[PDB]
Amino acid sequence: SMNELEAQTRVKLNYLDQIAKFWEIQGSSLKIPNVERRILDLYSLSKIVVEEGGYEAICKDRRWARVAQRLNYPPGKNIGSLLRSHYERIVYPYEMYQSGANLVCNTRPFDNEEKDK
């Protein structure tokens, strides 16, 4: 039921087709699973993380709690780990892509993202 995400007209489909092609041709498949009957809407995720001003910052500041709750996920903030796991495997290449295109802010602790220690 991808329509759940494809709901919005010529704003969703365009972004989706793009966010599909770049990733699928990168040698992978666009796997954005579901939780709580809500698909991982990369749109809101991306604009929120960017609005926060630093993916890396949210990571080391552990603010994925309020972020998950900002996406209106159920209490317990347990969905944060899900988000991380999907980000680090799907959306993180897009950080390097987007940030690397405009200005790469996570250029140093990127190592500490791969290695959270």
Swiss-Prot record:
Cysteines joined through disulfide linkages: none
Lineage summary: Eukaryota, Metazoa, Chordata, Craniata, Vertebrata
ARID domain ranges (all copies): 9-99
Domain of life: Eukaryota
Similarity section: Belongs to the JARID1 histone demethylase family.
Subcellular location: Nucleus
Subunit-structure text: Part of two distinct complexes, one containing E2F6, and the other containing REST. Interacts with ZMYND8.
Protein name per its UniProtKB record: Lysine-specific demethylase 5C
Domain-level remarks: The first PHD-type zinc finger domain recognizes and binds H3-K9Me3. Both the JmjC domain and the JmjN domain are required for enzymatic activity.
Disease linkage: Intellectual developmental disorder, X-linked, syndromic, Claes-Jensen type: A disorder characterized by significantly below average general intellectual functioning associated with impairments in adaptive behavior and manifested during the developmental period. MRXSCJ patients manifest intellectual disability associated with variable features such as slowly progressive spastic paraplegia, seizures, facial dysmorphism.
UniProt source species: Homo sapiens (Human)
Tissues expressing this chain: Expressed in all tissues examined. Highest levels found in brain and skeletal muscle.
Other noteworthy facts: Escapes X-inactivation.
Section of the entire sequence shown: 73 to 188 of 1560
Function: Histone demethylase that specifically demethylates 'Lys-4' of histone H3, thereby playing a central role in histone code. Does not demethylate histone H3 'Lys-9', H3 'Lys-27', H3 'Lys-36', H3 'Lys-79' or H4 'Lys-20'. Demethylates trimethylated and dimethylated but not monomethylated H3 'Lys-4'. Participates in transcriptional repression of neuronal genes by recruiting histone deacetylases and REST at neuron-restrictive silencer elements. Represses the CLOCK-BMAL1 heterodimer-mediated transcriptional activation of the core clock component PER2.
